[PDB]
Symmetry: C2
Subunit: 416 residues, 2 copies
Amino acid sequence: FADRTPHPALTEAKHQQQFFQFRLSGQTIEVTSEYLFRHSDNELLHWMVALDGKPLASGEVPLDVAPQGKQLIELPELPQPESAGQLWLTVRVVQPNATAWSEAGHISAWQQWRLAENLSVTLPAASHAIPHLTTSEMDFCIELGNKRWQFNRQSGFLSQMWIGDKKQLLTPLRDQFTRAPLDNDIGVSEATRIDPNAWVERWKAAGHYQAEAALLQCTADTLADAVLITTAHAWQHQGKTLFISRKTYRIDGSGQMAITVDVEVASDTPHPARIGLNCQLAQVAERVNWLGLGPQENYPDRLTAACFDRWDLPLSDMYTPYVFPSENGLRCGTRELNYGPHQWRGDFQFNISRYSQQQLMETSHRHLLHAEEGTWLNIDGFHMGIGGDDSWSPSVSAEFQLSAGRYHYQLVWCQK
Amino acid sequence: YQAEAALLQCTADTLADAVLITTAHAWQHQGKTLFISRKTYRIDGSGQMAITVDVEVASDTPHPARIGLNCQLAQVAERVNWLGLGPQENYPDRLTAACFDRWDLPLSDMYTPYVFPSENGLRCGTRELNYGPHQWRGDFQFNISRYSQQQLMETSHRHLLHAEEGTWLNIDGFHMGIGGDDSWSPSVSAEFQLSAGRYHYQLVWCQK
């Protein structure tokens, strides 16, 4: 920024430009120096092995590598844990002494790998409570203890949740296929010249910002130990169907709501910017805690600098204050998200903030944004890349476009 | 090749207009779990059986060659009719020559008689498959023949293969590439390996 505060992209540059490259083969790390003239005389390697966030083993090794040379670091016998989960190894190069240009402790290079995974073969514990279904003309209502869910039979969405007598939502949980466009999406270098190939022009022309959801199906069924809700919606713009979404909600005796989503996208509509859900939660909390890539904003085509771990930040750090407001603050590769009493589990990307996508799209300057009531949550199964080979022509590469035609993802929503 | 399926869950439920069966299995080899598979079968009043499959693959097992279903059908028919890429054998990294259309061939043309027997006769990008009274719909790759995968793996020469009773059907949601930059070192490119960790696909099985 003009005051010399970093954008999140600066960390991506730092990581790709590092002077140490790493390879893993079994228990061995090979370190390669990309210095041309200096010996690595102010460098030590810290390694850590963690199991879904929890530390297991750790260590340090001095680096003694000639310019353009290699060093092989053998790791100790790593622990075999009992429990399920993925093991992660992280190495970081630390400069122990100050230089003319850096403090003591400066981190100059890092890298992360997956080690052994143990898949979870334990079935969930059978609860004695059965959720109860009530049918009115307008609603399906499910009760279990103090918890209550309500589904609107006309719109076909989850419209409210109660813990005790405290409402949890200000806006229903609905599909989202759009983002507040980024500068790379807008694709303009001269204010007088509009490119009809820019992503934002293609999305407005196809009617992605105006598309209306029509209900096809909304049904409720009692199983032995669960209530199952089934919905289907079609998004249409002037006759043409753009997207179809089929959903199941399974509410069991443990309180957990499992959401399964299947989406179809018309092959001749421009590929969508995302496939996910959004809602406005009623409560504002101070912290956000997640298990996934972080701690800074990261996107499918800008996530090599980010590391899998357990991260915990104040809500204000989950918003990037770009001077021209846009979609911002995404975290990819996430397995668990905790915010107030809610927990979401799955394999998803999310962003969380006090500004809606509609507000970020309508506002030309960051100082004109005002915090809305509650918190906006966007949870995505899939998200398009951001591009940036240039900013005045489409720059997202074909492997980061959502072009598959059919998409599946699942979430669990529970109260921790 | 030796992995054994252990049952985790098998449950049945009546809905308003359907029966729903739920199963889960784990494939294990000497303590280690390689794959988990969760399935639902929904049989409705129209006769159609909808199958939904979700698979998890351990990140440190070598990526699998395919993720699908197989069975041996009791009947032998003369023709195979499908809507999808064809008419010749095609694989995810060799399908640019094939064209989407409605194809109809005798069963014997769905087998490629390579002199050294192997996996053969796959058709990708398929939306509908008809064989005798059965119809399968979805988005899948399939192969159909009188030889099992076990027979093709054990037999060194094509003249020593014998037709089994009935027809073997393999229906895949996902299939690895075949490679061939060379044949004496791993040659499948990373975009054709099944490395995603989690996989979903669905089929409808009905009687036309």
